[PDB]
Design a protein around this nucleic acid. Sequence first.
DNA 1: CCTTCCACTTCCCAACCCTCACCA
DNA 2: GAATTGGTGAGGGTTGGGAAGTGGAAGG
Lengths: 261, 258, 259, 1140
Amino acid sequence: MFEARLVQGSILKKVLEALKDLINEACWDISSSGVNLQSMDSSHVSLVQLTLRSEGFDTYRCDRNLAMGVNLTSMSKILKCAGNEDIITLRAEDNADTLALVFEAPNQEKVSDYEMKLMDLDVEQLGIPEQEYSCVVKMPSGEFARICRDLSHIGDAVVISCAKDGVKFSASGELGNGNIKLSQTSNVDKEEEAVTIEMNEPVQLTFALRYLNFFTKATPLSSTVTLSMSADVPLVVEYKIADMGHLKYYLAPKIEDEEGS
Amino acid sequence: MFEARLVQGSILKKVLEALKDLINEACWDISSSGVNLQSMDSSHVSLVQLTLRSEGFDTYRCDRNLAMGVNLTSMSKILKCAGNEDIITLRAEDNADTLALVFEAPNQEKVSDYEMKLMDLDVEQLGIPEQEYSCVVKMPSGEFARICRDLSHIGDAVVISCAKDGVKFSASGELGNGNIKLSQTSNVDKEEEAVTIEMNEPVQLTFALRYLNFFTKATPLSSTVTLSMSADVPLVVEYKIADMGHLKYYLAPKIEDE
Amino acid sequence: MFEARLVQGSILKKVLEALKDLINEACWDISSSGVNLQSMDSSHVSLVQLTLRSEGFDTYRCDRNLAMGVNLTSMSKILKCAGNEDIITLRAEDNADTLALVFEAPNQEKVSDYEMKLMDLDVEQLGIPEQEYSCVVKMPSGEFARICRDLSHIGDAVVISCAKDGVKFSASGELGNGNIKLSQTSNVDKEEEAVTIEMNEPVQLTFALRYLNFFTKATPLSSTVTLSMSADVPLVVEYKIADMGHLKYYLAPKIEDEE
Amino acid sequence: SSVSALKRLERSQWTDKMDLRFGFERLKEPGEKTGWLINMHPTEILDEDKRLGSAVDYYFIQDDGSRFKVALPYKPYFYIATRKGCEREVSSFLSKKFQGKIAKVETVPKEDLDLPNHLVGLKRNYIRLSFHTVEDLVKVRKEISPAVKKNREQDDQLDNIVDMREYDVPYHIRLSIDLKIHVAHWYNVRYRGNAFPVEITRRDDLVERPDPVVLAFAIATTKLPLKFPDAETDQIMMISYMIDGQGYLITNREIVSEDIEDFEFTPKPEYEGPFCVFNEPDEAHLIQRWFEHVQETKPTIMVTYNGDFFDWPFVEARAAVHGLSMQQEIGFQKDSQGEYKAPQCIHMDCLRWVKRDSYLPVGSHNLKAAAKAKLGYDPVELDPEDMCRMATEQPQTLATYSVSDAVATYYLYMKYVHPFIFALCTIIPMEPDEVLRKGSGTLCEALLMVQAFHANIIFPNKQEQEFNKLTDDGHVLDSETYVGGHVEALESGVFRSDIPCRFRMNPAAFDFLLQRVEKTLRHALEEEEKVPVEQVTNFEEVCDEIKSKLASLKDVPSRIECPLIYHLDVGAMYPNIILTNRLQPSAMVDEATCAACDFNKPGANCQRKMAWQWRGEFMPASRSEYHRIQHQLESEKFPPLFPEGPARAFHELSREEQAKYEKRRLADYCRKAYKKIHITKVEERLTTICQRENSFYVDTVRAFRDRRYEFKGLHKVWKKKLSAAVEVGDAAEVKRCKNMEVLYDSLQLAHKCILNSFYGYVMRKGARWYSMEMAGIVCFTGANIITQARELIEQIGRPLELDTDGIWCVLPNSFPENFVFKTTNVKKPKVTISYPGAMLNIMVKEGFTNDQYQELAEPSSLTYVTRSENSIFFEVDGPYLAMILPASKEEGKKLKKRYAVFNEDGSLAELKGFEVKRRGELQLIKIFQSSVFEAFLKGSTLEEVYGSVAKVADYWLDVLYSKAANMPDSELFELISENRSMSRKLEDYGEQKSTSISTAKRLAEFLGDQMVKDAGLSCRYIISRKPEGSPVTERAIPLAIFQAEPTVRKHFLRKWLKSSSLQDFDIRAILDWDYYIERLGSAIQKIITIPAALQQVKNPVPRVKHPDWLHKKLLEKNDVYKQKKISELFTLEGRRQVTM
DNA sequence: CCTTCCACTTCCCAACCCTCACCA
DNA sequence: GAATTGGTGAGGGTTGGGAAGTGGAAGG
Ligand SMILES: Nc1ncnc2c1ncn2[C@H]1CC[C@@H](COP(=O)(O)OP(=O)(O)OP(=O)(O)O)O1
Ligand code: SF4
């Protein structure tokens, strides 16, 4: 069996509500050490990884390491039944036919239970370079979310420039041009309300905003987001949960013909 | 001439819209003892019973039994125009084809005066017979609304079971079954937070959940709702508007193949 | 060069939110006195008039009076970027093909900077008529809007009656007919509930509810609305912006003589 | 009772005097004569006991112009079936019960297709009942036919009656089925005197026909302005007609301002059209003169166009107003069906041919269009409103018009109709009145009945309709159907042999074809050509050039070539598939009926299994919910049949009512409880066809097919004569042979229609041999062959369009194309074969061709031969010069069934589905499409082709953007008109909203129900702007208002535009120019711009944007920052797949 | 006393149903 | 009584669900 409980379903709800829109079906790898997910678009442009440490759960067990496939919209239906303060319990058995879910009210006035149905899936697995990145920026999550939405209205793609002075996002469409600029927060009340840039050397990149708009859906998981970039290689953006672990989105930039030419 | 005046004028807005989707049109019945209706939806699964006692009105005059065909969509669009704070007056004549409505604001600045055309309706009607409902329940309205809404995503028919411990809702469908349990709670601070269950003998039955998402639209009528069960008998949902009246929905169970 | 700076986004946002239904592309005119615009709506049923005086901006540079063609839906889809608190600045060079728009967080933690293509527009126009009026009515905007929407539910058009005791509306249609009166207030405590009427002569007039129900879109722009009315001359509906400016709509009465 | 018999005698006498007045002497004296059978009717006659009995009056004509009648008595009969051994008791009971009501009863053994094990030779004893007259048959059947229901429902001698057959077949059609009497043949007739039946017998050798005197007529009338005429108030101006090449006119000087004078009209040298003229002083004199002239000339064929609709209701009224009974003077009376028919002569309406048999679109079902299409000349027009002035100001032009209508009517009857109708009547028992008027299904039922009687097989009763049957799972079925023809549109844009085009190819396909060249050509020569491979001389020579050209392809698959446009389709496809598999409506069998059959022996090859796709839609309701609804209907009550009546309880209603009430009541519940109102399910099934069952149907199809091939063979022979005479330049021979070509082509098209009717007949409601499976199995077998031909052609080349019959394709220039094989035999010294044909054909040889054909060797042996057969053969058109296809405005979709093709001769060869052909679609669309198709021929490069084609459309956009400022003031009222027609009475649509209904109500508000009153109303409108934001259907303005009185126009437009403030009520202000601009924008986009961007050229038209989806995809192609996949940056650790 | 979450209403696009006429 | 079939395009109107924005109530 696998068996776990969580202090607040809000975390798992915001997780599923951020995954559901991008990756349609995916499979979890499950162990005594925790739960992991890695999966890629059917577009193959972008990639998702999630780590939920066992130590973040309220109570956790796994009898043997397993994996299982789930259609995420089908699961995301049932968790819509869980209330914001509800306490949630998950179970499975090594025959791996079904996922059992139970929700308890804080006052135990009520019990809700469901039996979600598993599916068969194929996936191709990608290694991560684990390099360090020539620039990293850490930022209020809602401010990046709005930056993405606003520029998505300006055009189809963002240009990102990171420099020692700060960071700039730019785009254009047949209407014209748009720029948004941030620079180091000199006076900080708390790091959760500050922007910080650290760098080896400046970088310039371009990305298709349609994916960023789906990445920002994780905003309610944290007050802040991290973005890590190095020239001519994928941008990584990360949200982390103090208990559970981390959610990472990976996107491959656009590149010019002149390199091949 | 029929005329009456209602101080809590929002009730007419609420109780009308709690039918706007369930029945298109009906012949409202008026007498010295109040305003009344029985009606059936064209699907003939369900019956509606409505009564507001004249004793509850701020003013009431009625000099003969009066019947008036109204399509509820029209009055619904009229009652959109009244605020929840306004006082409502209704007037009708036995020698005219229009219903008059007057709205009065408590500031005395604002008044309104709506006239709508009656329609020519008649219907053959049975009084719902007296029933000894073997099980009766009271619940807070929002909880039952959430139960039916949430189960509606899993499926389209609900099995409800009652027992000495309380009640269970259960559903099945292509995405898999689920259940909700409400046991008889031990003690409560207020009735608006409380569940109460009475059961002479255990019963479980199947009901078409796609209909209950209509009845739940009555929720703003009352903080609590009364329900009743018995074998091979329509289930009751009952709302009561303070002490001044009632609205009840009667719905047949799904006739199983066996 | 031209530029101007303003601490409020809200006014410039909600002006666009009001215009976007009536007009698609417009030529602004620009002067030491401020920004002006008048323009017939696309259906030519009604005429919009607007101005913001230069005194309303934080600072204002206009080396020469000029006019500029712009697309309303694009400028709206740009201005949706700004937060309501954000400081706005607008600028253009004397030969730019482009208008540049800058929005700043009050803390200056963030800058945003956008550009829109100009276009070559000119429009043929009258010096707007104004008169003394048979009736003038002051109302809380939200109540006038709600009344207009409720009458639009029952019917196509509203007929207005003004008198010493109060202002009355009526409408009729396939649902029946409906009648409403607002009394003059017995003693105004403050204007935010005050209904008051200036009465030179009683008037009754009829108008189509579609266009009033478009004029009402400016309701967030000010808590009070004013109606200016006389027979055989356009109704004007007027909203006022801070002290700095005004927005008005001109509409002709739906002639009853046809019946 | 007796008074009714005397009234029937009175009308029988009246008709006998009426035709005797027209010269049809009855044969009174014993003797023998010969004559040609032109017509018949059933009528009663008195025997030697002076008992009334039923008979048929045959009508004969002779080459000398003599005519006569013969009456032959024949007893009507039908069959009853009886329970085992009851037949003597049942016949004794019936014969005593109905003594004097029935003529004879007898026992007859007949074979019945439904009998178990019947191919052993089994048959069952039906009892025939026969009667002295049909009125006793009708009475006795109305006595019996209710009584047999209980036997059906449960499982006095009457209880033993199990079933009854043929009790509803027409009486007269019995005689011509039974005694082989058929129309348009020469017969001897021998009358012995009244003691004996007449002898009638065919003589075959008099192949030439006589020439019956034919009259055709038409009329012109007064009418009210802007509105329909009425027969009470209006009066005939002129009546024009022709008899056997001589024309005549009568005119009324009460109305026609001057005398007409005789004149001659000849559009083409063949139509000599000499018209005589008579001037008559008054309408009554006009009518009496016409009646006398007809009674003088006494035609036997009388011809009109649409004459039951307008002409007869007019002339009958105008005659009766002056007391002239047309019914008594001529004989014409309106039948119960509303069709004017006569006792002495045949009535033929040309429109009822054009509609059924011409293969013309409804766009050309008007007399003027059918004349233009078939006769090859332009008729003359008068404006229907101006005839009122024309009769006053210029009588001769109105006469000329009416004569032109007469000439067109007569010659159109003569050329096409006259050969065809009687030729078909040689093989259908029916009169020329029924064979023209009856539906194409009933004809085929008669042709089947002939054979089924000759086979001595009793008919089944008509199929009885079913309502709300259930799926096995219980869901109530709304609809059942089979999946039809298969259609695909693989490509888009332009193709021309004149320009370079790129191909890519699979070399294994060339290697496969090259490895079989001889095996293909041998079959192509021997089976299709029927020239033995031993008689060809140089067979080895051409095979080497074929093999070497295939090798030259194999070495280089990818190439640029010129394309060869070829169409490659099956001839007579569904007949041929029926014959090849030997499908018959009776021959589908379940397993249990095979298990009942003694030929069900292990290994017997008689069972053929085939597959088809069923489709059906059912409501979501449960079986138990439907039973709940029925249980609730146990006490419902419903309105009376009529306002006076008491209300009817639900159990009183008919099944037809009850089923509709249930269907509505359940549909409402479904809308409430299960949001999807209907569920659509497709399912494949397989069905066994028996191969030993009687062949009568398939042999019928074989004979009819071979007749159509007779006409096509004569067409080919005369095509040879024509092409020779044209090459030599023999004008007289060309003229004659071209007439024979037209005659045989139109005959073979008509036979095409009737032959094809044999397929769809099997689905007709009520058909005697009805079965759905044989209608599906053909469609699926036709979808396979074309799909496999798409596989093969896609390997060699690029298919461009499909339908049910055959592929349109481009092939590479190097392909083998055509060869001539020479021969010793001087009868066929050159055989020409096209390789693409045999290339396709061999796959049909290998896979499809039947290998389970069986035929009875000897009826007494009960033994059968086994044989193989195929008749499905591909044949080849072209090659063609150019092809164009449109493409869809939505992404991922392609427009099927819309395309244009051009002959190498450089002129329009085909133009299918486009709005030019549709009836009354917006005229501007027609003119634009017409011009652009011809424009595609111009230029020589895609840049040139699209740059030129754009210039045609851009002119029309410039027109719309200019508000047609230069266009003549009257022209817009035509160019901008829609003419959308409406089928039903405006009552019947109920509430449903559409622009036709909207503008018909808008006219009814102007001119009242006098227009609305009857079906088939026509509308013409423009869509206006000024009631802004009102939905589209509420801005419709009928054109009529622009000709109404100004003070009424300025009333109705003021109402409809809700505006007196519209200062000028001018169409140019009123038009919604931008709506018409969007209509044209769509019509240009689907042809000239989206089919451009798919051919990698830029958008050729600046004024029209692409759809934004295409703008985005095209611009994304056009920038340097390519989107990488993540697979290019991160290392792939492996593939993993998860099991539950 | 201020900010966030829940509930309600408005707005926009895709899909489905009606007609008539043509392609097989 | 009298009655061939199924697939598709174009136009116009109706119906459902999801996304966005605002106001009210609860939590700290
Ligand atoms: N009127 C009709 N009714 C039913 N199905 C019909 C039909 N017309 C066509 N079909 C269906 C079934 C047949 C198919 C079209 O093939 P054909 O046998 O009509 O032959 P074609 O190529 O037109 O002419 P040919 O080569 O014989 O001279 O479409
Ligand atoms: S298919 Fe063969 S077994 Fe079946 S009924 Fe025909 S002959 Fe008998």
